[PDB]
Amino acid sequence: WQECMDYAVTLARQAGEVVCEAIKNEMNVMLKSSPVDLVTATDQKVEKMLISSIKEKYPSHSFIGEESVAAGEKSILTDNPTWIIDPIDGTTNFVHRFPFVAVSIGFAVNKKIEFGVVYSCVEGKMYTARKGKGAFCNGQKLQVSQQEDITKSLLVTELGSSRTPETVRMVLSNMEKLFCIPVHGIRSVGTAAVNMCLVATGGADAYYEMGIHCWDVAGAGIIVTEAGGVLMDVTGGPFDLMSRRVIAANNRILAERIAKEIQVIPLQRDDE
Amino acid sequence: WQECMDYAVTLARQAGEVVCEAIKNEMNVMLKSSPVDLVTATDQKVEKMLISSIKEKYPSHSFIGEESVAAGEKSILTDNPTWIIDPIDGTTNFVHRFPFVAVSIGFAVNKKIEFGVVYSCVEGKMYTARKGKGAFCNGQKLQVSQQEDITKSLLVTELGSSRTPETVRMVLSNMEKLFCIPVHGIRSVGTAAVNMCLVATGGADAYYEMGIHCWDVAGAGIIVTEAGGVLMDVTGGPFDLMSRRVIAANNRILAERIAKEIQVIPLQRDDE
Ligand SMILES: O=P([O-])([O-])O[C@@H]1[C@H](O)[C@H](O)[C@@H](O)[C@H](O)[C@H]1O
Numbered sequence: 001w002q003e004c005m006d007y008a009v010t011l012a013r014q015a016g017e018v019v020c021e022a023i024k025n026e027m028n029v030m031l032k033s034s035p036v037d038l039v040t041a042t043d044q045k046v047e048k049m050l051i052s053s054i055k056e057k058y059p060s061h062s063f064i065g066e067e068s069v070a071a072g073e074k075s076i077l078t079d080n081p082t083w084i085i086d087p088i089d090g091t092t093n094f095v096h097r098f099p100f101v102a103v104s105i106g107f108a109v110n111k112k113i114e115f116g117v118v119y120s121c122v123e124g125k126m127y128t129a130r131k132g133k134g135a136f137c138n139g140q141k142l143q144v145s146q147q148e149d150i151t152k153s154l155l156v157t158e159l160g161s162s163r164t165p166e167t168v169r170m171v172l173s174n175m176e177k178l179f180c181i182p183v184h185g186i187r188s189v190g191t192a193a194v195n196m197c198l199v200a201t202g203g204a205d206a207y208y209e210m211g212i213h214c215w216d217v218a219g220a221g222i223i224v225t226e227a228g229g230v231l232m233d234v235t236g237g238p239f240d241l242m243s244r245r246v247i248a249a250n251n252r253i254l255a256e257r258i259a260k261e262i263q264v265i266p267l268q269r270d271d272e
Numbered sequence: 273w274q275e276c277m278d279y280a281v282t283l284a285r286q287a288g289e290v291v292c293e294a295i296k297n298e299m300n301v302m303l304k305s306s307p308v309d310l311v312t313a314t315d316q317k318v319e320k321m322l323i324s325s326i327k328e329k330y331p332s333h334s335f336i337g338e339e340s341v342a343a344g345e346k347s348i349l350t351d352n353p354t355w356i357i358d359p360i361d362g363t364t365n366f367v368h369r370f371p372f373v374a375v376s377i378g379f380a381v382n383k384k385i386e387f388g389v390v391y392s393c394v395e396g397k398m399y400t401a402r403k404g405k406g407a408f409c410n411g412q413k414l415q416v417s418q419q420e421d422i423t424k425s426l427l428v429t430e431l432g433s434s435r436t437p438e439t440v441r442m443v444l445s446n447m448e449k450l451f452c453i454p455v456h457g458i459r460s461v462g463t464a465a466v467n468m469c470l471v472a473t474g475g476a477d478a479y480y481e482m483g484i485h486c487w488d489v490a491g492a493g494i495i496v497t498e499a500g501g502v503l504m505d506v507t508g509g510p511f512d513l514m515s516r517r518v519i520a521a522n523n524r525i526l527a528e529r530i531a532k533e534i535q536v537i538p539l540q541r542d543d544e
């Protein structure tokens with residue numbers, strides 16, 4: 001797998017420069033399922049680049065990509081080596097030139113993530129992790145924080161892609177409960193992968209969100225765990241790559257305290 | 273005033289050095305008005321260093337410093353050349369190693385801001401702006417976005433320092449109104465100065481918040497305006513550096529719209 005991983009990094013840095021060059025220019029913004037669900041030509045171009053370059057070196061491997069799924073593909077995970085890709089995580093940020101956009105790649109064999117590569121191109125941070133090998137950012141080994149007291153934690157989360165009054169009110173309600181525990185604060189950088197990568201570095205204590213997809217957490221999840229953290233479903237149950245929900249914390253203590261506070265929003269699984 | 277400005281940029285970098293060095297070490301985290309209102313020995317020393325270095329060259333100038341005010345000094349602005357200082361804007365981030373901390377310095381004469389210096393030490397970004405000279409970040413001229421459609425804007429704001437149910441509910445409700453207009457999204461990096469600087473670059477279209485202090489925005493405000501932006505009061509009226517309220521936008525079109533949507537949160541002015 002090291003051959004594939006080293007290849008993924010080269011590919012990530014490559015797709016990374018395409019994105020980071022495109023960000024400097026005027027874009028043609030297009031909508032997908034709503035006026036806030038955006039996509040551009042770069043999202044599509046980069047994804048086709050990645051898939052081709054991968055199936056060119058590894059023709060037997062399967063692929064699960066955000067735009068490919070929107071192109072007609074089904075997001076079904078088998079035991080076969082599968083590349084779970086998100087060409088640009090932070091499309092809205094990308095469109096606005098907000099300094100946080102990443103290229104995310106996850107690789108799963110036997111339905112388990114072997115390695116994850118997350119490239120934050122604007123800042124030039126390459127986050128990588130291989131099962132049992134550790135998590136790193138530009139050669140620097142990562143380690144999650146040791147905070148076990150919720151009232152002294154810094155959390156990260158996003159408001160979501162939905163504008164439905166009920167869904168929104170529930171998200172804000174969950175945000176309120178945690179906020180008033182209280183915790184030191186809540187941050188929102190604009191991308192699931194980076195938010196999680198910040199938890200891995202220890203700059204944030206935990207991340208939680210409902211509404212995400214497999215391509216959002218496939219690369220960063222392994223990075224949090226290899227940094228010493230834990231992944232979990234919002235329900236307190238085990239993490240599920242297709243569940244649309246996740247809690248990426250420094251330790252099990254915060255994860256369960258957070259789970260205890262938030263109310264689940266009904267979501268449709270990616271494998272349905 | 274240019275001499276003062278040149279001296280300011282130097283002092284800010286020197287302070288930035290100190291802050292960014294301490295951020296990697298063990299620190300004594302103390303409390304101010306509550307368990308979530310923090311301060312560290314670095315906040316205290318950096319301010320003392322700044323005020324002393326300034327008082328040496330310009331002994332006839334006045335100062336307004338967060339920690340000085342906390343120590344008993346009153347935040348009263350006069351027509352005399354006053355240095356409005358925020359040693360560390362983003363103390364909670366500092367304590368958590370969250371990659372966004374800034375040293376802010378605002379210089380006012382006749383109660384108007386002449387220049388501002390904001391140094392984001394972790395990123396090594398020096399934001400500066402003299403009235404009528406333009407705003408720059410590391411020697412590159414800044415310019416706000418041109419979005420006049422609120423439904424395509426990206427806003428930045430913070431949840432605040434209060435955990436009072438009543439207040440937290442107004443903050444989240446104001447957030448709910450803007451989010452469901454809808455807007456493309458809402459971000460929170462954890463520091464008012466940087467949030468405003470991101471608006472000056474165009475990465476975000478507008479920033480708003482009620483609860484900040486004069487030292488939080490004295491430096492970044494001139495950067496937004498010099499970048500082509502506008503500072504406004506939540507009432508839609510002119511900006512009042514001592515009111516605890518602010519709307520820093522790319523243009524008046526968006527600013528007026530935000531002021532229309534949000535509800536005022538009762539607060540004690542800095543001059544009361
Ligand atoms: O659309 P995308 O920009 O690839 O990814 C989005 C980002 O990860 C965002 O932070 C998260 O809150 C959304 O749920 C995702 O869909």
Ligand SMILES: O=P([O-])([O-])O[C@@H]1[C@H](O)[C@H](O)[C@@H](O)[C@H](O)[C@H]1O
Pocket residue numbers: 358360361362363364430431432433462463464465481483484485488
């Ligand atoms: O305490 P400080 O970190 O210097 O300043 C705070 C930060 O700027 C924060 O982002 C803002 O939301 C608060 O209102 C400020 O008081």
Ligand SMILES: [Ca+2]
Pocket residue numbers: 038091
């Ligand atoms: Ca998307």
Ligand SMILES: [Ca+2]
Pocket residue numbers: 043066086087088089090091
């Ligand atoms: Ca994407």
Ligand SMILES: [Ca+2]
Pocket residue numbers: 086088089090192215216
């Ligand atoms: Ca994504």
Ligand SMILES: [Ca+2]
Pocket residue numbers: 310338363
């Ligand atoms: Ca403070």
Ligand SMILES: [Ca+2]
Pocket residue numbers: 315338358359360361362363
């Ligand atoms: Ca401060």
Ligand SMILES: [Ca+2]
Pocket residue numbers: 358360361362464487488
């Ligand atoms: Ca501050």
Ligand SMILES: [Cl-]
Pocket residue numbers: 184185186364432462
């Ligand atoms: Cl905070």
Ligand SMILES: [Cl-]
Pocket residue numbers: 158159160456457458459
């Ligand atoms: Cl958002």
